[PDB]
């Protein structure tokens, strides 16, 4: 038993980050459109292909389309890939994530990759970003947080833009609080620090952000993580 | 001027407290069954953590109303020379809630008479609970379905559970929790130097480690714990001056 032990991130591809991002919604949801989210979903894509993945983004889909999308990526095969990303930028409530027209629970997505359906990640780092709440010239938007911070399965991490009692903050041009500060890091530490580590910074940048002196007096954030890995997690650059 | 590696500042008089609420048995007409086993957890844990300087209040069996006088009780009491806190639950549980002797009790009620408003002393410092409960049902192994809801609980908090949603604890009669005893082992070797997240980790990967393929009704009900992290600065336990 070793305590410094890391995940084998030396496989010939890092793999694929996947990044669900949704701005609109239809009609008859009467769900308010998140603006600013093209900003985070370019700043992600940036900032994982950086550190090697594969990124695939999705705007927009319908539960049927997204639905097919993912079951795609987790049914091809991954046994030469290190891990395994998967973003989520919608409206989200209690277990489930707002596609273009209907919820999908969270755990039918992640429960895609746990290893008895996809053995090729099986003792991989399975990373998931979740920035997501129930929604009511650069102005910041205010949401209280919403969607159950619960991890996912062995070497799940799930990522939470905000924890229950909080309020999650997106400004229309920048994008969300969260999304920044964790690109920030990622840009800055991506590459060398212990992932942990970093979404821990992350926490730090985002519980910081003052909300003193609108009505958004008083809404503080705070995000959290959920791991349930079993070895340190490092993206060193490949070669 | 940020700094990647900062850490929670661990140089107060005292560690603090570590409060384990330890359950056994119940009220009868709850129908939960004994845990045999768990005082072998809450002296592991007692030895861990007062060995990592914490000091260390056990209290056995309390009825809900003495629970909540209990914790409200070192809520209130100055913690401003402490580095932080630690609370253990070692009990049935299910949900949002944990049962006292007598009833449940909602986490987030006893988890809440430590954040900001309401206990200042323990602002920005690390708030960490433990939590070994799911709902039951010569050393042998039981094995009960996760229950517990795994969340995070504030900013500074660190929620630890034995077991996530589909898993399974077990606990052996004479030994104590699977988890608990993994926990107090790399408490015992690695408390005092490693940052306690990636403690935790080590833990996780213990606890699965342990095969589930002596009772065929057991096979395959693999354990897998986690953790919940609000922790804004890394954690180490160095021994106190």
Redesign the interface.
């Given at each position: 038993?070793d305590?410094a032990?890391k995940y084998k991130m030396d496989h010939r591809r890092r793999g694929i980050a996947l990044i669900f991002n949704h701005e609109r919604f239809f009609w008859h949801l009467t769900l308010p459109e998140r603006r600013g989210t093209c900003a985070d979903r370019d700043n992600l894509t940036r900032r994982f292909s950086d550190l090697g993945f594969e990124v695939k983004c999705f705007n927009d889909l319908k539960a049927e389309e997204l639905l097919l999308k993912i079951h795609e990526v987790s049914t091809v095969s991954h046994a030469d890939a290190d891990c395994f990303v998967c973003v989520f930028l919608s409206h989200g409530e209690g277990n489930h994530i707002y596609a273009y027209d209907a919820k999908i629970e969270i755990q039918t997505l992640t429960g895609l990759f746990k290893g008895d359906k996809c053995h090729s990640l099986v003792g991989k780092p399975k990373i998931f970003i979740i920035q997501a709440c129930r929604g009511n010239t650069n102005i910041t938007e205010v949401d209280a947080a919403s969607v159950?911070?619960?991890?996912a399965?062995?070497d799940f991490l799930m990522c939470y833009s905000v924890?229950?009692?909080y309020y999650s903050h997106r400004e229309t041009v920048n994008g969300s609080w969260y999304i920044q500060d964790l690109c920030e890091m990622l840009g800055?530490?991506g590459s060398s620090?212990?992932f942990?580590?970093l979404?821990?910074?992350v926490?730090?940048?985002v519980?910081?952000r003052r909300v003193d002196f609108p009505s958004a007096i008083g809404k503080?954030q705070?995000?959290?993580?959920?791991?349930?890995?079993?070895?340190?997690l490092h993206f060193f650059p490949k070669s």
């Amino acid at each position: 038993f070793d305590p410094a032990e890391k995940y084998k991130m030396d496989h010939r591809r890092r793999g694929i980050a996947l990044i669900f991002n949704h701005e609109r919604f239809f009609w008859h949801l009467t769900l308010p459109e998140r603006r600013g989210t093209c900003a985070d979903r370019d700043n992600l894509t940036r900032r994982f292909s950086d550190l090697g993945f594969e990124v695939k983004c999705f705007n927009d889909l319908k539960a049927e389309e997204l639905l097919l999308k993912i079951h795609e990526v987790s049914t091809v095969s991954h046994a030469d890939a290190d891990c395994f990303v998967c973003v989520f930028l919608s409206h989200g409530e209690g277990n489930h994530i707002y596609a273009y027209d209907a919820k999908i629970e969270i755990q039918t997505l992640t429960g895609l990759f746990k290893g008895d359906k996809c053995h090729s990640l099986v003792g991989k780092p399975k990373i998931f970003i979740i920035q997501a709440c129930r929604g009511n010239t650069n102005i910041t938007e205010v949401d209280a947080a919403s969607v159950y911070t619960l991890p996912a399965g062995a070497d799940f991490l799930m990522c939470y833009s905000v924890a229950e009692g909080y309020y999650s903050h997106r400004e229309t041009v920048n994008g969300s609080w969260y999304i920044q500060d964790l690109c920030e890091m990622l840009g800055k530490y991506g590459s060398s620090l212990e992932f942990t580590e970093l979404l821990t910074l992350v926490n730090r940048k985002v519980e910081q952000r003052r909300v003193d002196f609108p009505s958004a007096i008083g809404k503080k954030q705070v995000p959290c993580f959920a791991s349930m890995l079993t070895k340190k997690l490092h993206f060193f650059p490949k070669s």
